[PDB]
Every structure is written in C-alpha cells, then in structure tokens.
Amino acid sequence: FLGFLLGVGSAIASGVAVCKVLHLEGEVNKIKSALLSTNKAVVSLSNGVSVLTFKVLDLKNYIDKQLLPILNKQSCSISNIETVIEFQQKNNRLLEITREFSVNAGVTTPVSTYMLTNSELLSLINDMPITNDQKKLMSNNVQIVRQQSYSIMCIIKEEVLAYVVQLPLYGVIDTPCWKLHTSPLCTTNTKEGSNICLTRTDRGWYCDNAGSVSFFPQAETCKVQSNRVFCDTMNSLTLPSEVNLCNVDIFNPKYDCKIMTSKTDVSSSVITSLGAIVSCYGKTKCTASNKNRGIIKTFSNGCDYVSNKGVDTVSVGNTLYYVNKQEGKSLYVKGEPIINFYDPLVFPSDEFDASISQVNEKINQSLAFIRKS
C-alpha cells in the first residue's frame, strides 16, 4: 500500500545512453572492426565506458559468400532446394527481432530467445566484470535474468544492426529476507455499526542491505525461485533496521509502524508463504478444507490463521483460495488483538496512511478536548 512513497527513475537510461554514444561518427565502424576477428570483444566506447560486444548473427557472410555466388553465376535456375530452407533458417531470427521491436516500440521487456539465446546469454554473463558468486547466480537463474533485463534497438547502418541488451547487476546477494503479510483486524461485536477496523500497511518484502533494510511495497515486482528473492532496488524504500521491531512489538518507541484505520467490516483471506490468514466478520462462511477429507475447520469471528499442513483450501463467502503447498514450519504467536485497546467512540474511523504514534496523538488530542468538560 506504500507504493506512492517510492521515488521515480528512468529504467532504460543506461541503455539509451549507450545508444546515444553509439550514434557518434565512427563508433559503429569501431565495433565492426573489433568484431571483424571474433564474435565477442570488449570495446572502449567514446564515453569511456568499456562494454562487451557480441556478433550473434552473420548474414553478410552467408549472403555474400554462400547464396548470391551460386544464384547469379550462370543459368540463374538453382539445382538444389535445400538452399531455400537453409536460408529460411538464419533469417527467421532477423524477421522475429524486427517484429518484436515493431510491436514493442523499439524496447522489449523480458529479453526473448530471438534477441539473445541461452548460449549467448551465458557467454555474456561469464565474461562480465563481476565476482564469481554473481556469475553463478546469474547462470543458474537465466529466466529471472531475462525477465529483469531490457533490449533497446539502438541503430541500423553500415550493414550492421545494433541493439543494447541491458542486463541486471545483482550486487547484493545472500542477505536474509522476509515477507510481511497483513490483514484487517476488527472487533467482533454483534452490533451493525460501531465496529472499528485496524490493519498494518507495511506489507511486502524486506531484505538486509548494508546495515539497513531495503523494503519493497509492491511485492508483485519481486520474483521467487526456491527461497531466493529477486527484487529491483529502484522499486524500494531504504529504512533503518529497527523497522523489524514492528514484528516483535508494534508499540516500541524506536520505530513507528505505519497502520490504517477504517470501519469497513469485510471478511477477507490473505494467503501467506506457509498458511493463510482469515479475517472472518459478519455472517460470512469461513472454512478450511483438505482435498481428501473435505471441510476440517470452521472459523470463528475474528482474525485467525491456519498452516498449510493438512489444509488445502480456504473458503470465505463465495471466494475459494488454494493454499501454497510449500514445506516449512509455522508458528502461532498468541496475543490479544490490538483493536481491543481503543475506544470505539473515540477511534479515528478513517485514516489511510497513518501510524501508531499519529493515531495515539489524535486520540490524546480528542481526549484532552473531552476532559475539559
């Protein structure tokens, strides 16, 4: 819910910069001369930055030394038809690259096999100026690399087509991460109104980074392979470590945990990594079921939780939820719901982006106003 606090930045600024440096008079001939010998070479660009350069497809060689010599020599009628298919190969790639650039306005999100093959991508990763740990990580997760990289069509001139493949740089690796799931926490009185609801808004991913915590509010922009969380530092805030205290105690004086207040008595289900949170309010049907034995639990009104062990389905009203069957150990920290600490008549019925201290200050203000009489 904290996506508006993030700063905005240009994602393809580096690739576009390399392109603008690639338009200089004599830079395409530089790259072509460098790749005249082999299919890959390090080239110092006119801006000073040294980039790796790949020749992934050679059509001038094939066209000018294998197809046109046999075609327009004498008796232009050709004797073998395997040349037609051999030319349909090695040319589909150019057509598909052209079409991908046409439909994606010249810069394509995840980098396809047509843009860059797995052998070429691994060869590019292995020859990068990074530590061996990042090389191993990138080589094992080539799919996440493709998802997190761009390909900007750069220039086409001097018989050469150029595009910049802008790959991620996984500088921070192997630090502990944790996901935070939240759900509305309301009172369970039978009255139609006067039912106050409180929720935590700091949901999303958190990772240790240089003594601080990189927090990602839009958890949708974070991929998970096995237990590794690939995130983008640009879609993130940077917070002190004390924010983690919000889990051991939400009233601690060090960090102020952002919350949200409302009066909407809505039953919901939030599926976590290993289990499910169920906020069952009103006359709604809340059910936990196993695939082979049917319904095994009926939820009482309030905020409850079940583990993914033995539970395969969570039903809330008409919504059906399949729980993640990932293995692990779950823990239930018993405690009294915080919502039982406030007065329903003095509680701020609506505040989108607030915190514990802010709500407490408004409560202090209203109580000081009331006490004067």
Binding site: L52, T53, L59, I97, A162, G275, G335
Partner: protein, 72 residues
Amino acid sequence: QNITEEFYQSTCSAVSKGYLSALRTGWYTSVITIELSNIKENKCNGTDAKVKLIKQELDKYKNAVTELQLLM
C-alpha cells in the same frame, strides 16, 4: 535450516523468514550486433519456382531491413 513463518494474532499479520536476497543494484549494458548485407536487389529470371521462392525470401529480408530503418 529452511523457510519458516510466524503468525502474530496480536496485530493479525504473518512474517515469512528464511529467504535469500538477489537485489538489482545496478545495470550492465552490452552492444549486440547482427551483420547485414546490401544485396543488389534484382536481376534474375522469375521462371523457376525455387528462384521465385528465393526472390520472395530476399524481399522478406529487405523489407525487414527497411522496417528496421523506419524505427528512427
């Protein structure tokens, strides 16, 4: 060990620990090239079927090159 998860009924929220980080701290650009040919676009007899097919393929290739040129 492995992935663990704690559910706090106090604040109605769950935390899932045990994951590892791989953060995009930066970028690495790399120029990738495809060498093209300026084939002389004519002069053969369109009497054969194989030659007509090769000529159509050449039309496809040059139209691709032209489309790429129009991306500026």
